[model samples]
Target: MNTVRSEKDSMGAIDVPADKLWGAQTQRSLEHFRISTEKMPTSLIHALALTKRAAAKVNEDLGLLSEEKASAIRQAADEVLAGQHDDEFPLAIWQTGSGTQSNMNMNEVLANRASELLGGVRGMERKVHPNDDVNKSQSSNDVFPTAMHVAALLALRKQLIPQLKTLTQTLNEKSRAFADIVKIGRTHLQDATPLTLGQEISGWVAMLEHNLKHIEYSLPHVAELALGGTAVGTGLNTHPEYARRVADELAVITCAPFVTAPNKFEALATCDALVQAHGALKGLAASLMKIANDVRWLASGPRCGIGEISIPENEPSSIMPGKVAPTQCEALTMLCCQVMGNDVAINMGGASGNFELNVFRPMVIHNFLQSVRLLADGMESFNKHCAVGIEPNRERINQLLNESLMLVTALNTHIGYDKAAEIAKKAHKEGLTLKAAALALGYLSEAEFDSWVRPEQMVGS
Candidate 1:
């Protein structure tokens, strides 16, 4: 039952799976590159379909394609976007660096399906040709980059930003809740001063707020599409009005504010826009790493470590019997590290762009979307499992706050810095309380020490 049907490309005829919608080019790519198991991201494939659909509409409007063929292409593209033909796209991510094969794969799938839609056979491009109809007015160089921008923008707008907003809001709420609960603040892993737990969490809220702004700011750059640039940013073989109109069509389709790049050369040859956008993702990951590490450190041990806060006990330790760990923090931190690594990969790919085109398109978008997926999912999971479950260990917090000798700094205003330092050192050396050390040192009276060294008062300073 493994029957194969023959489809011909410029390279000649090749046998494709009889039931598949792909053509000779796609079949050749599938057989040629067995490099990795990583297939083209479905998001990218759907974005390519949307790009094709938008192009067909624009081309039909420009009188470059027949209404019947354009309508069939639109319907077929919608089916692909609706996930009706996921199996048809079988090309690996390790294909031609220009992603030409993947682009042709999309063209072939849409063309084959559109041909069938017009009551024509699938393998034979009788009524609608892949290059002539489906991929009309577009080149792999332009279409692939356009689709890359679309996919990255969609991932940011649809997934990462929303999850980031949720996590930020949650952290803000926690910050507000802990505002009055003063705790010992640490610097260099040593107790330094007094700050409310709310204040510490607020720092996290501020970081994410800044990240949201940075990521959103990069959107306009990433939204600049390279559709009309054709083979090498020349706009050859394309209608003059094609670029602007197709962008308008895409904006309507994706609900994103996509615009044509003013300089198609920069759009095609450089992925700096994508690099900057992923840099924003890297910024978010950096903040998340710090926040996750802080949570785990504060919630270090139930009795032995800082123990100022408690996170949800996700799982039991495999070897330690009843031990619970900061698994969410570990997971989030790992995701953060991956995002950093992805940023490096994207940077190298972005710089790999030579004169007119970046051949590292597939790897660039792959690592980019991977970061988006990981950060979005990681934020959601960390928020749900760990962040929302964070609780103040008030008993532990109060103990640490009282034991912190750095509270001697509050007396500096009354006495001098030298005197305050003496009190702190004496308190540490004798393991005495700050108040006891101050009284024994004879630098300040008991009444003055009592009136001056207050944790609540120090928090405001």
Candidate 2:
């Protein structure tokens, strides 16, 4: 039926696919883990490649790996980094939650490719032992978790943090430019007071600024690599300098400062660092959800509901003719919900740890990286489509500001609280302006109501 290449591991003979680079372990996983269609994240794949490269170089330095084997390993690892051999890693994310299958998947693929460079057959473990050389001084327990840390750190540094900064700066610019636009503010979805459009945007800016602090604070924990803690975090069968040296090599490779964790057992066993990092992402998702929903509300209607601002019209809405929905806002809000959902998964996975290892290694990293990507892409789109070209409906804004009943709150200072309440209730009942109602009741004169019941004065300071 299927093209075959016979291979043997400790499990004895196996039928690996003929055209594949993966050996027995990877092939077995592919057959066994057809459960979830979800593949591993590309970030984790590249991180594994980078990890192998660093380990190979370190092994070469320690004289544990030959020059030929080290050079071949690096070349193969670099190909994996450049996404040349991505197809070789076909294991589903659900297999061996410690991710032993996936770690061995990388090991087998790298070893086979490296073995080919030394004129050996595909399944020849003798020529380039997957564990002894490519995975030298590494174990599934340590290597998989180290890969997770590197992936999360790189995503934060290279993608999520940068996108967040761009959005924050864009929001800052809009806040500065929109400072003059005073509008009614709401509490319990009812008019309560007044504030400028710029001040509202400034509030959005503060949420992101706080999220940045949270993420930046949580990342150093992620940068603490769990390398050299070979199976169960004892540094068993690994050199004492292996952890520190590999981290140094990885720092240079990734261009991010990574360090070996001071407590190997603690670092490997508790995924509390990743949990804290993901907690920061959940905070960001909540912030983005509020910000995006606010944008949608403000941009709600041209002729109907709270049409205070207009974002870029992407296209005519499919269901509403000539009506352009706040598409970016919709996209951003959906992504936020998804990120928040992923947080629950990450939290559960982080707690699945016991004693010497966290078994849910792949789940933790998968959802963490997925959230980082969603947030980054969603922020970029939100900035480009919504924040960049938003236009205020100045006439509508001013009209609403003048007509709102809650402007009577200001008159509490002039006519006393009880009198102001009577004026507000009378205006509501008689469907009259606060000015007319107050004048009719003789609570305050026209000149007095005008001076004390000012919306513009409610904003500054």
Candidate 3:
């Protein structure tokens, strides 16, 4: 009897063949892991499908498999790429902890689909085998990690870094736009000095630039693949040239620098690279959160809060009347803080080194992927709504700067530190202007004091 299975005709009732062995595993995954809301990382799934297709071609070229057999496997993976094999990806990430269930899910789906594509019984291994032909000379330990690296690199290049770049550009534009707009500069939560709105924003731009560079520096470590190290990082059963050839093929496919892992044992035993990458992402999130927090506070209210700057109000609070809030900035700040916290968890997960394999592989990748998505989406929201181009209150800034006792630094050159301190103390006591206090103290002439206390001249060389 023919054992070929046909595609499901409807969403509710799948027509998986009764003879197919994948039915039980698929059903169990669906029943046990009822996690339907959280979808697997799209980039990861794409990378896995890509790796399988590339691996098949490489095996065919190496004469490990016949051309016809390799072509059938390739076509099956292509169908997966075209969205035909989603049901097999039903397992929750929590299952098997080590991702063995997920690995089996991929193996079974590819095998059964490859069998059907080759005009054989869906569960038969004669024409296109899953483990022997499709997964030939490979193990879950190697393939899963390699796919993760590729997916992460793709996401960094295509999604995360680009969004950060856009944020940097937005900040740079705002800096230029507000360059001459002067504002009060606060220190220790009190007004202390004077600075241009542009200057303040330039600091934010610099922070983002530093983060983007850090991420770029960390990309190479993430791009290194442990594919050739089959079971136990020894390349046992895998072709000698397989690792190098696979790396080369991945480089071509990804259009990025993909390299072989220098030490498979180290790669498998420790996830230091992932930890370091998360550190960089955490740093980025922290920096962005700092900026978002500042924006929200500075734009808090027109009358009650700081009111130093105005953020574009996207919506009004129903309870608080005439209160235009910085909702987007607040949300982005919370998101960044949450991502930073997750990175801490990721670092802890990656600290495992009990045996030949780091058992925390799935958790590490999952958290890292979550961080990437949060940073990417948070930045988009920031640029769209929160980055409020500053319009400084020059008069208020100048008045506050002029009244500041911290301006005693201005008299240090002419009157010296001791006399400047005396004058500042007296001015604080009498509530007199610096000039009046200085003149009364016989420190200097009005003209000399006026010229000496210039904030620009004092702050500059």
Off by over 4 Å in 1: 317-322, 411-423, 435-452
Candidate 1, residues 193-270, lDDT tens digits: the string is 778999989999999999999999999999999999998988999889999999999999889999999999999899
User: What's the CA RMSD for each of the models?
Assistant: 2.3, 2.3, 5.1
Q: Which candidate is the best by lDDT?
A: 1
lDDT for model 2:
0.88
1-461 in candidate 3: lDDT tens per residue?
A: 35544432123434345554353345455567776465456666677877887788888879998888778877877887788666557656555445555655566677777777778856533455656776787888888888778878888888899899998998899889877665667888886666777788899999999999899999889988888898799999989999988888889877999999999987777777888988889899889888988887776655566666666767745787648767788788788888878888777878756677777766677788888988998897778776644455455456666776767777998879999999989999999978789989998999997787766643322
On TM-score, the stronger of 2 and 3 is 2
TM-score of each: 0.94, 0.93, 0.83
Give the 10-residue window scoring lowest on summed lDDT in candidate 1. Answer: 314-323
lDDT values for all models: 0.90, 0.88, 0.76
- The local lDDT score (0 to 100) that residue 137 gets in candidate 3 is 70
* Model 1 residue 10 CA deviation in Å: 1.6
